[PDB]
């Protein structure tokens with residue numbers, strides 16, 4: 103009955119939707135571990151080291167339960183909240199912390215190989231020792247957390263590359279992989295992957311708010327959208343392109359990095375609307391739902407250009423409650439029920455929407471779509487990854 | 492007198508002693524700026540984004556006054572505390588923030604050239620925009636601070652390479668260079684450097700504590716160690732090797748990275764201790780003062796090996812008053828007055844002591860010395876950098 107605990111964290115600059123992906127990366131690994139030993143994944147509390155990223159509202163120590171449905175995840179891999187780890191093991195005590203990093207020697211191409219090795223630390227360590235020789239660190243904002251040991255792993259391939267190593271030194275009841283973004287997916291478009299991805303189902307509350315918005319302002323219900331919905335995700339398998347979707351255009355415009363990132367892969371507002379109108383005409387769509395990070399000045403400019411834009415603006419208390427990821431989820435959930443969707447180039451946000459649309463069963467031609475930069479020369483659309491059951 | 496303002500910050504992992512080096516790099520940029528426009532450098536508050544790195548108990552927004560002598564600093568370049576800047580500009584408002592970064596394309600060997608260019612941001616920018624369109628950021632832990640605009644600058648050479656660009660766009664009353672560590676020194680061994688370096692003189696109360704420790708436990712005073720002291724640091728010049736030093740051996744052992752960094756350039760505790768006793772024999776020194784980061788188990792073992800070791804262990808309340816860099820500065824100060832000194836390989840802490848010793852005038856043969864790895868073959872010693880008065 104004595105099992106082992108896996109914990110992870112991601113490089114602080116990474117956003118909500120990248121973290122959702124790394125999660126599947128880590129789940130791949132844990133499944134590989136479970137073939138041998140008893141393990142359980144501990145869900146890293148939400149909220150970010152950089153507190154200024156989410157203005158005026160503190161997003162901190164947020165359980166997954168506020169975003170995703172725990173039973174839904176559990177049907178895939180054994181999973182527990184960090185606050186629960188803290189209760190089962192005596193305190194917030196982590197035996198081994200492994201900071202993932204690349205190989206310093208690099209490689210000359212043709213050498214590249216999936217491998218993992220204990221190595222000296224490349225960047226100086228962000229953990230440090232107290233008067234008790236415990237390692238103090240970020241630890242998802244739980245200040246009282248202590249690692250017993252920290253060191254670095256140089257690593258290359260898919261996440262499961264690390265399992266032999268973790269399965270060897272069994273001394274560690276709890277192991278944490280920091281900088282888990284270093285791990286790749288085992289196999290991304292694959293059945294194992296989809297089992298996981300499908301199993302992350304939004305919390306009932308965010309779905310309900312999103313659904314009611316769909317019916318009030320989008321004239322969109324699951325019935326009218328020919329999206330038969332099922333509760334247990336294991337039991338929901340839908341034929342491709344059967345789903346119709348609400349009579350509206352979903353769009354995701356990402357302005358955040360447009361300027362300082364010197365981007366040629368994102369449109370001007372004026373360009374974005376030209377495309378949008380072309381889509382509305384093509385598909386006979388009266389209303390467009392826009393999910394955007396745009397600032398007020400730029401939003402007004404968009405609002406004037408495209409009056410029929412409908413948008414979900416959380417009230418102050420809604421934001422205080424659902425938090426940031428929460429709102430993002432509603433926006434995603436709504437875009438995902440659109441008749442047709444157009445996203446932003448290489449946006450992780452748009453990526454999650456795709457997967458979500460593929461799950462609901464919407465035709466790919468309506469799914470993998472992106473705005474072209476105004477003068478962008480040859481603009482390639484995102485790649486369609488079909489589900490495998 | 493409407494003068495421009497310069498502010499900077501350094502990559503968060505960076506410790507206290509690398510920061511003090513960067514300061515001089517910046518200060519050399521300011522000197523080059525003063526050849527044209529009226530400027531003043533704003534002293535970035537001490538205290539760290541990653542708070543768990545410091546034993547300082549969330550002690551933050553610390554002015555340079557608690558470490559360095561402000562008049563002393565001001566005789567080198569014009570300088571003000573950050574809170575003073577908030578008062579003299581209108582609010583906590585920085586006009587332009589430049590995040591310093593390396594050139595995206597790297598270089599081919601032989602192509603390396605000092606250059607600065609506005610470029611697309613490589614890493615995702617840590618600053619983020621609010622609903623008033625202002626950028627919020629870490630900003631030395633002052634939540635109120637607002638930047639008006641943010642972009643990344645790719646840069647290569649010495650810190651003064653940024654000066655011409657900074658003088659072209661004059662619309663910016665205040666300018667902040669984030670990731671300042673990307674700038675090199677102008678010329679490190681030279682007069683200009685040494686003017687800045689000599690000008691950084693520890694706050695009176697800190698030296699007063701060290702002299703107290705010296706007088707008491709080390710049987711050491713300036714008049715006994717033949718180290719005449721001079722308040723006006725411009726008026727302090729000593730013949731090289733005129734300084735004797737106290738009847739003790741100063742040693743700096745940094746153990747922090749010994750293990751996780753797989754270090755071969757630092758000794759095991761025994762290798763350290765044997766080397767110490769041999770030095771005390773050779774140089775006829777009665778007592779030994781050790782400045783180290785060793786945590787309990789190690790210190791315990793170090794204490795058995797070297798019982799005659801005297802150390803600076805501040806009281807709970809002392810650590811509060813002087814804070815972290817204070818305890819460090821005291822330790823450094825004490826080391827700097829030893830008759831003979833031996834440090835740790837590539838330790839910024841050691842470098843800072845090196846520099847302080849050259850300033851007191853102690854013979855180089857007694858300054859630039861490091862412990863060798865137990866099995867380290869080459870084992871180069873640190874390079875003598877003379878003051879040029």
Ligand SMILES: *[C@@H]1O[C@H](CO)[C@@H](O)[C@H](O)[C@H]1NC(C)=O
Nearest residue numbers: 235236249250251252253750
């Ligand atoms: C941490 O790891 C090292 C290397 O395996 C080990 O020798 C040491 O005992 C560990 N530290 C603690 C506090 O258990």
Ligand SMILES: *[C@@H]1O[C@H](CO)[C@@H](O)[C@H](O)[C@H]1NC(C)=O
Nearest residue numbers: 320321322323325326327349
């Ligand atoms: C809304 O969509 C439904 C499809 O079920 C359609 O029958 C109806 O005409 C639409 N109503 C409006 C307000 O356009």
Ligand SMILES: *[C@@H]1O[C@H](CO)[C@@H](O)[C@H](O)[C@H]1NC(C)=O
Nearest residue numbers: 361362363639640641642643
């Ligand atoms: C700020 O700098 C960017 C360069 O990244 C520039 O394009 C933008 O127009 C500037 N904003 C203002 C308000 O001057």
Ligand SMILES: *[C@@H]1O[C@H](CO)[C@@H](O)[C@H](O)[C@H]1NC(C)=O
Nearest residue numbers: 709710711712714715716738
């Ligand atoms: C202290 O230093 C003096 C040199 O001024 C030396 O002569 C003396 O023997 C030392 N010892 C003690 C205990 O005073």
Ligand SMILES: [Cl-]
Nearest residue numbers: 149161426427
């Ligand atoms: Cl969030």
Ligand SMILES: [Mg+2]
Nearest residue numbers: 761764765796
């Ligand atoms: Mg011995």
